[PDB]
Each structure stands twice: as C-alpha cells, then as structure tokens.
Amino acid sequence: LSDEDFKAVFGMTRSAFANLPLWLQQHLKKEKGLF
C-alpha cells in the first residue's frame, strides 16, 4: 500500500500503526481483510 492508501484503510499513518500493541495491529489487519 502507498502511505496515502494505508492512511485511507486504517485511519492512521504507518508509524502510528506501529505504535499500537501487536494485538491491535493484528485485530485491524483481520478487520480490514488485509495481510
């Protein structure tokens, strides 16, 4: 994903996402159907 596409999907930047706990990172990936 481009940075703008990432922000569109997850509502946050890649670096913000990386600050989330792993459990929430994985929650969001499943939720959005990615990775």
- Structural domains of the chain, count: 1
Task: Please state how this structure was obtained.
Answer: X-ray
Range 28-35, long-range pairs (CB < 8 A, 24+ positions): 34/1, 34/9
What CATH number has the domain bearing residue 14?
1.10.950.10
The DSSP result for 1-35, as a single string, is --HHHHHHHHSS-HHHHHHS-HHHHHHHHHHHT--
What's the one-letter identity of residue 4?
Answer: E
Range of the domain at 8: 3-32
CB–CB of 14/3 below 8 Å?
Answer: yes
In the block, which residue shows the tokens 């990615």? Answer: 34
The candidate with the shortest Cα–Cα distance to 26, out of 11, 13, 7, 10, is 10
